[PDB]
Design a binder for this molecule. Structure first.
Ligand SMILES: N#Cc1ccc(S(=O)(=O)Nc2cccc([C@@H](c3c(O)c4c(oc3=O)CCCCCC4)C3CC3)c2)cc1
Lengths: 99, 99
């Protein structure tokens, strides 16, 4: 739908069998979820942000049901303070910025 | 106009007279800009990023032209990786998220 930005755009995502809320962040390239157990193999890597870099585990092709729609792609797991849905998944559910 | 998220939603902003590149970040509450000279008096602030917190100088009433549209609000100046345009100034231009 259309989402106004007076409030944090927080949605409910279904991932790895668990429900979690996340923030739609158009600024982020990837999707960073809090430390949790996901199945598969992963390669460790470091993403940087405001404040510095954090070490994370990159799992490939994971399915996420972000707000009623499914999407597949990479998910980085680690010590992030908030669950963030980034560009690599926002494009899959057809999200655009309009003004 | 309408922006698809296949590439970084970078825009040309005009602040302080200089032209700068900025990222439209819907997850960011406030606008954070790399170091520079702005007018007035400031207050201190700490904003929480993915990798931790950083200290910033808050300036209010700053005139700013986000790709054509001119908004007037608070800008935080600090040690950021890239200039971010947050919701405080994104609601001023009428920006929304659609899908
Ligand atoms: N929930 C929440 C929430 C908590 C704090 C804040 S805050 O005070 O605005 N601080 C604040 C200010 C500006 C941005 C941010 C975010 C953030 C990004 O969107 C991006 C990156 O690192 C980040 O920390 C990576 C590279 C730089 C830009 C690209 C994407 C946080 C939400 C994840 C937080 C905002 C929201």
């Amino acid at each position: 739908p259309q989402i106004t930005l007076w409030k944090r755009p927080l949605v409910t995502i279904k991932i790895g069998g668990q429900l979690k809320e996340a923030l739609l962040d158009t600024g982020a390239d990837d999707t960073v979820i809090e430390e949790m157990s996901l199945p598969g193999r992963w390669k460790p890597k470091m993403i940087g942000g405001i404040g510095g870099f954090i070490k994370v585990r990159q799992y490939d092709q994971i399915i996420i049901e972000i707000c009623g729609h499914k999407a597949i792609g990479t998910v980085l797991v680690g010590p992030t303070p908030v669950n963030i849905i980034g560009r690599n998944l926002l494009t899959q559910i057809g999200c655009t910025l309009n003004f």
